[model samples]
Target chain A: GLSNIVLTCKDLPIPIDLLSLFFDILNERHPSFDEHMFLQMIRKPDDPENLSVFLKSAIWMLSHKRDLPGHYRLPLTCLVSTYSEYFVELKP
Target chain B: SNIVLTCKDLPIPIDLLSLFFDILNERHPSFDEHMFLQMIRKPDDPENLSVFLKSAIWMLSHKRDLPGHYRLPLTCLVSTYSEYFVELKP
Candidate 1:
């Protein structure tokens, strides 16, 4: 499923591998999922000047974990915590 | 003026939220759907969605017992929220 899914911005300045991975897995598991809307949600932060960096890091970490044989879960929580804080900091 | 956000504004459906909680409870048990929904509904703030994303991440990352494949949906859920927030800029 992951192989079949391709993100328009996958090769852009911001990384989208995680988004692709998620879409592939989730779309396969839940066929009734609203993929177009989900795509809109995931692509919402593609701006390189703003949340792009942190978002890229978050996506990279998640994708890296998935590539591992064991797929350690510790980093996932840590990643979210860090990203959430960064997100809050960016708020006006 | 910024548009206020709430659980109702979330892209994912209520049914998926329940499904997500079920997936989360598999690792970090002890929370009901009502409580979880409460955490995500920020009313006027977008931060509420962040709360749920953090909780989901914690639940997925806490215990290392589940199989990789089993957590795919949960992981996907986290990714969904991450993207939503990134786009939101809130």
Candidate 2:
């Protein structure tokens, strides 16, 4: 059922480097981010920018709640939220 | 900002995703499982989810290995992946 969506390279145009950097930041900081699930995300046909925004917001919320280190929280939150807004503009 | 690899409007490669997945499964298998499960369990824990997703994505992008069946439930994988991306905005 899911396979019918017909996702092509055209459908998902996230920069490989941006994707790499995004994940790199996550790996360096978060202990729960996974590779397999990320693979699934890039493969599916959706707005990569939207996904990026969501990830950024999620990170912000995580840090704000004290789930992650406060030291990194400020910088990470700024980075994620700033980029999220940037991507939101790209999406529209 | 230094432009390392300059190209114009390149479409994102799909095979790259597959390649990265294989690498994560092979090189950082244990950490991959740990993060994936952590995200699924907590769902709301971005710190955990971010670490898991980032490690997995990095592994997928940088590593290379033999391909085989993933030793986890597809439904679980899908659910966790879906939730991770979805909950980012909600």
Candidate 3:
């Protein structure tokens, strides 16, 4: 069961349980993916370099989840949108 | 040169460990000193010691209720094991 604890990744306050379960599936599917890097991105997303790295990872997730069901895809979609919003807000 | 103790062994002397037990007992009576002592004495892994030291520092710093005597041992342990103290760093 997933806990209700909120983990604010960048400006997105995602439920930690959902993130945990999502990571479980993501990691199993993508062995090359780095959870540590993903966490670093979430923990300090204000850094453009870190966000850029995360953007690449998110793109990979979207492309690779072709065989997976909608439940897994939605979280990845939400993450990409959230990432986009951050960059859009920073635009002058 | 400044005295630099290494993290190769447990930093807390027997006396300091005893004092720590005393503090824990006063504040958290439910804590089992005997079990803690066994773990400290024969820590199967190096990371276990690092974790214990880190927790001690957190309690000492956050609560700010310990005496002046703790400063010397705590500072020495922290300095020598600075690499393990990554989580607290900026």
DockQ of each: 0.03, 0.04, 0.01
* Tens digit per residue, CA lDDT, model 3, B1-90: 754434345355666667666655565565567746754455333334334444454434443454555555544443333222222211
Chain A TM-scores for all candidates read 0.33, 0.34, 0.51
By lDDT rank, best first, the candidates go 3, 1, 2
The 10 consecutive residues of candidate 3 chain A with the worst lDDT sum are A83-92
State which docking tier applies to candidate 3: incorrect
- Pairs of colliding residues, candidate 3: none
lDDT for A86 in candidate 1 is: 27
Q: How many backbone clashes does candidate 2 have?
A: 10
How much RMSD separates candidate 2 from the native structure? 16.3
Which ranges in model 1 have alpha carbons more than 4 Å from their true place? A1-9, A14-92, B1-45, B67-69
Mark the 10 consecutive residues where model 1 chain B has the least summed lDDT: B81-90
lDDT of 1 by residue, B8-90 (tens): 33355555566567765554565556656654552222344544565555445443444344354444555445544332332
| Residue B4 of model 3, lDDT score | 42
Best by lDDT: 3
Q: Which stretches in model 3 have alpha-carbon errors above 4 Å? A: A1-18, A21-37, A89-92, B1-90
* Cα error of candidate 3 at position B5, Å: 57
Chain B TM-score (model 1 vs. true structure): 0.46
Q: Which lDDT tens digits does candidate 2 get at residues A1-92?
A: 44334322324323334445556655555545556545654444144433543454445444334444333333333333323322211221
How much does each candidate deviate from the true structure in C-alpha RMSD? 15.5, 16.3, 17.1
lDDT of 1: 0.44
